[PDB]
């Protein structure tokens, strides 16, 4: 029934914002009553937090999997496989992505979740840049953590604008190539 | 008295969010009554829209001024002078920047203002990249408008995270050099 509430919420978020979804809407979709809903989640806000937590951990575990089983390809394709984790994971859950980013403004728990994982993904990015510099493949230009931070924030803004069809945005079918170019040139360029 | 209302609002936004500022707060600061406030602005939301409109046009007119009077320096310093318009203009009005970005979620007029100017700044960016390619200084890699869009969105997210001291963020004293590196490598890199 927890899974039914979560699937109901993800389905309804494709049609309307969390503000237009009632606890009664979530309960009906999961085949339970309102007070029975409160046995599983304290609020509709907690439901979105759990949905975002699932998608964020999905992306994180995919990047951990790549990290353990390196692809046998050139540096451009290495970075492309990493960015693609986020493109495919968040782009496969557009309504949770959209609603979760909007909740950053109003939910300390959402803001803290997003902050925690971005710090982790930025640290990992910087560690890989540092490894590329140590082996002589990348030049020692900017501080690696500072470069990693700007590239990770570029991807957050640019992928999510693309998925939402914002004006302006890179077309979704061009956004991966766009970001790979900017990561590879900025990491390997003198 | 319009200028007094606007100065009052900019001052109060340094201490608290627009949600915690009342029309009565703005009126008191400008030395007028509540109904007299409504003679100048329909809402506190319109006051923020005007503040954001002023800062956005300040940045736009600064970039127009640079465009007319080119600086006599290398390509890295050219791009640095352009990014610096946004760093100095928005970084000199941090409370309006913060409040204006937050209002994008709730105000169609704010969202449309921000969208309109980003389109203009992206078009100008793409026109300069195209000129650099035409003269043989930049290689024909990505579509220039797509590259321009991702670089402009990177700057929006990265400058505003820096000004807000978000975790994560590039330190404010490093953010200009960080962005200049990524623009120059991605625009001139093969
Ligand atoms: C083959 C193995 C060793 C992977 C090596 C390539 C790597 N890629 C990354 C990386 C991290 C973050 C993001 C990124 O997109 N952040 C932003 C996340 C989001 F959601 F905000 F967009 C994109 C790539 C780090 S190392
Ligand atoms: C010497 C003359 C000819 C200027 C040539 C250098 C140029 N610089 C730009 C440019 C445009 C936008 C931004 C930019 O930061 N956008 C994002 C704005 C904001 F506010 F969202 F951060 C940054 C530089 C375009 S051509």
């Amino acid at each position: 029934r927890e899974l039914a509430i979560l699937a109901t919420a993800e389905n309804l978020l494709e049609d309307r914002p969390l503000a237009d979804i009632s606890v009664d809407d979530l309960a009906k979709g999961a085949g339970i009553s309102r007070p029975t809903f409160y046995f599983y989640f304290p609020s509709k806000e907690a439901v979105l937090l759990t949905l975002l937590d699932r998608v964020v951990n999905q992306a994180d575990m995919a990047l951990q999997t790549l990290a353990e089983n390196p692809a046998d390809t050139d540096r451009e394709n290495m970075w492309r496989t990493g960015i693609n984790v986020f493109f495919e994971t968040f782009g496969s859950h557009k309504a949770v992505t959209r609603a979760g980013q909007a909740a950053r403004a109003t939910s300390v728990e959402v803001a803290e979740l997003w902050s925690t994982f971005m710090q982790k993904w930025i640290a990992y990015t910087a560690a890989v840049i540092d490894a590329e510099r140590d082996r002589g493949a990348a030049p020692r230009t900017l501080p690696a953590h500072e470069l990693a931070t700007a590239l990770n924030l570029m991807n957050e803004r640019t992928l999510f604008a693309s998925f939402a069809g914002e004006q302006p945005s890179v077309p979704e079918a061009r956004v991966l190539d766009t970001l790979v170019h900017i990561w590879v040139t900025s990491i390997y360029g003198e």
Side-chain angles (χ1 to χ4, degrees), chain A:
Chain A
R1 288 195 294 193
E2 191 187 328
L3 285 179
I5 288 164
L6 285 168
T8 303
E10 182 157 25
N11 289 333
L12 292 177
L13 280 168
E14 289 159 30
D15 275 7
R16 36 187 220 276
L18 186 70
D20 302 4
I21 296 165
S22 53
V23 170
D24 294 337
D25 292 329
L26 299 180
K28 184 191 189 137
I32 66 180
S33 72
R34 174 188 189 86
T36 292
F37 169 96
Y38 286 115
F39 187 73
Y40 290 100
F41 294 97
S43 53
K44 63 179 177 169
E45 288 84 7
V47 178
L48 175 57
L49 177 64
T50 299
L51 284 169
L52 181 60
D53 184 274
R54 296 282 179 90
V55 169
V56 161
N57 275 282
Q58 183 180 165
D60 193 57
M61 289 179 72
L63 186 62
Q64 281 181 243
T65 298
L66 277 186
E68 289 170 9
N69 312 284
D72 175 3
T73 195
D74 56 29
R75 72 205 189 174
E76 172 171 338
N77 216 253
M78 173 181 77
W79 289 107
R80 185 176 341 261
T81 67
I83 299 171
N84 191 56
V85 164
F86 296 93
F87 179 69
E88 282 293 336
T89 304
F90 288 100
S92 291
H93 299 278
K94 289 187 169 70
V96 170
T97 294
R98 175 201 90 228
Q101 292 299 306
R104 289 172 63 186
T106 59
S107 170
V108 171
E109 296 190 61
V110 170
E112 288 188 348
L113 174 67
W114 192 255
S115 175
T116 288
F117 280 81
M118 288 293 285
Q119 291 177 57
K120 184 176 184 188
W121 300 328
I122 290 164
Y124 180 58
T125 304
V128 179
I129 294 170
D130 277 336
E132 289 292 274
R133 294 171 175 197
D134 285 351
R135 84 173 179 92
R140 297 187 183 283
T141 54
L142 294 184
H145 195 270
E146 295 177 359
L147 173 55
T149 297
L151 292 176
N152 273 256
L153 289 176
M154 173 180 63
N155 285 16
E156 177 191 301
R157 187 76 187 92
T158 307
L159 286 175
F160 298 166
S162 290
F163 294 151
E166 294 186 21
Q167 210 163 77
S169 60
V170 179
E172 187 173 358
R174 290 296 307 145
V175 71
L176 185 57
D177 279 349
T178 301
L179 298 172
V180 169
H181 169 87
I182 298 163
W183 279 59
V184 172
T185 55
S186 68
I187 294 170
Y188 296 99
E190 307 267 353

